[model samples]
Target: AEFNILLATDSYKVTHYKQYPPNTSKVYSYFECREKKYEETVFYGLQYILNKYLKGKVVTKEKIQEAKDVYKEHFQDDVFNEKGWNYILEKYDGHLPIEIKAVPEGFVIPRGNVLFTVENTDPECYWLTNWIETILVQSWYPITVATNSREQKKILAKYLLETSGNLDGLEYKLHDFGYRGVSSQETAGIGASAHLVNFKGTDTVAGLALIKKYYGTKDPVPGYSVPAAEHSTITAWGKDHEKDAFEHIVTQFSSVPVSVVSDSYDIYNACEKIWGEDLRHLIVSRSTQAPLIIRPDSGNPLDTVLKVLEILGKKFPVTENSKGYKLLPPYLRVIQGDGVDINTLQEIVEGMKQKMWSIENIAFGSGGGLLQKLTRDLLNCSFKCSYVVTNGLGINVFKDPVADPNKRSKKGRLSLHRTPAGNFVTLEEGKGDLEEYGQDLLHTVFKNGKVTKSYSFDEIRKNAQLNI
Candidate 1:
């Protein structure tokens, strides 16, 4: 079957409040959708559904016509009529077939690395490339965040596993509490996906819908309870003195594995005074299965975490559990939130090692830094390489002007192979060049408007575990 794979570019910068040139009369004359602002949304929605639904369908003229008919059927008023549609279709004449190469959603790619590339099928379709720019960049951000977050989680996990004695023994939980902190709802979904790549839990339940639709999974909890895995938030703002904060938390939660923000007043003082002696013992005495997480917001996370550990150690001291042996209670973990990116986390790990702090006592809850801090401009996440058609032959080309020694785009359709040593290496970068590299990154996800791959929520949860 002849097929044309349609990859929808879902990135939109207008959400960032950046204004573009006014829609001109000339441009609107060619496309009716250009006449209305909502038309762009309609077109994008159609494009997204088409790309997703029509996956692996033949990219023949007949297929394109069928796709258009389907699009018109759904969006009857917004579908491009003959004059408008023909004007846009004429732009793609003589273009080479386009292919996409992207890093898998869960892989950890470093800065300046080419995460993905898009090449055109016909040389004439190069003009259509710019049309998809917004969506492409937007789609990529979550992948980038997921990549970075996975690495961060790995580092955190490694630190915890090493310093805490057992990798499997520690209580683990992650939450995508970054919705209000992201650029938009779309970003929130994507950011949550990235967070899921490393840590297997999220407060962003909406992201589960996307994950199920795209990756085929709904089990956001990592082998844990769904509603039982509770999320925490702060009632007091920065540096505000609220004596009843702990009382209020205890009353509301009433003995769940609750996480409470402890930095409303001085973080150090809060750790020493608020959760100091009586409350600490009370929390441990109350819960035997779930854990209580003391979260510090609005502070130098690493330093604050270290200090909190020191105080908690001196105040609570590793005491005997209900069984009587000297064991830390399940409800006695420190959660560090605020300003923790990869660099900060790396630095914190190094410092913890140097100072010999008990890393097992810490968990992380990232916010703005996790979701909004990194951008395409800061990370150079973009279409570094593109496909072009020349003399009817599809050619893959790199477009980056500045060359970094280590960061170069592989020039063609590429296959990724994972070595027996558990590292992925690029095998080959040309058409029909079947080199035994390792494993393919992009699987055949969709075929002929039907999803061929169906992954269970457990499978996605398992996929997440592979990262760490």
Candidate 2:
């Protein structure tokens, strides 16, 4: 339960100081996405990590003592670098002598490029750079979550354009339900903040708290939620009184959007008899324009959503948009909250388009698939020692495995650049300084255990918006 920065790294890292080539003065490393499941990654989350964990005087004499104790117990050896840590405590006043440079958060760029780089500023602490890799590599969580969320945004945007003709209200289409599905409260907060870069809808309070605390949103909050009923709230009324539960929610949340679980007993029966037939007039006549969002929590998401849309379209006054797609009245809508993933969302959109139902007719809620379903390998995220200064001589370093060419890493220093045509490409060696290559996208955000640059949530969101 102790939060010692020295103990926050891999145990083997504690022994790496002696393993490095003799007379090593400085170690340079970079974090990158070598291969990616998607073409581009929405670079995100490093700002939060830097400010929360890596900034300021993170090292302490007591923390050094704690790490020494922990390493002694775990390794059963004298591998702990007690001298190096104490040296840091005395030399830098408990602040790490490391500099971190990274691409601005929320820029959408291709994989196989450096996202961030690290190096020790002090010669004595040459081992400090990669030793901090364990914590820095965790930027993968937010980056992956942000990338997945942005990819989902593209999916949502494509269908909305093909059907609804514009991206209106697209921000609220995919709501975050991943709060309970993730491993920790911090994961929820980080994942939710990543998703918020593309959309404003979320049920995770932690996500809102993180954006408010870290990103400093100008608005009171960055994410929004509505009154929604869970299965328990609806089922507590019993199967015989499902209509009363629906009507009760409609009455309570009449002034705002209310989501009622409609599949407690029978989805077909509830959508047909209860919502479409019985409580139809009560919901349709609400004074507010906010729709009564009927949620189908179980069954094949694509089929169930289409059926619910059909039922709602028939019961409510159906109108046609400028694009000629069917639209349910503002008082009625559908939300498919279960079994939602990127692929499933794609299928649902395609299904809706084929069935002539507007993508605007329904919204989505994702839990596991949105946040916890991904991994570091999705982007092949890695932090490697790329360049080093040994005995006052600089050398570029890399890994090339005969077994897998994909494992081969870039040699020399790396930098990212934007072309005149608006395409982004990684420049190897020292090409970043050349006139043709222009300015390097990588900028120093952290140096000597302090944050050098900060970005607001809105700025990141603007950078993430699709060019179209």
For each of the candidates, the C-alpha root-mean-square deviation to the true structure, in angstroms, is 10.9, 1.3
Residue-by-residue lDDT tens digits, candidate 2, 57-175? 78887888788887888998868888988888898888888898899888888889888999898999999999989999999999888888888889999999988889988999999
Off by over 4 Å in 2: 433-435
Error of 2 at 30 (Å): 0.6
| Model 1 Cα shift for residue 32 (angstroms) | 35
Estimated TM-score per prediction?
A: 0.65, 0.97
Which candidate leads in lDDT? Answer: 2
* Model 1 CA deviation exceeding 4 Å by range: 1-84, 87-134, 169-174, 218-245, 277-281, 319-329, 377-380, 384-431, 434-468
lDDT of each: 0.50, 0.87
Q: What is the lDDT of residue 428 in candidate 2?
A: 68
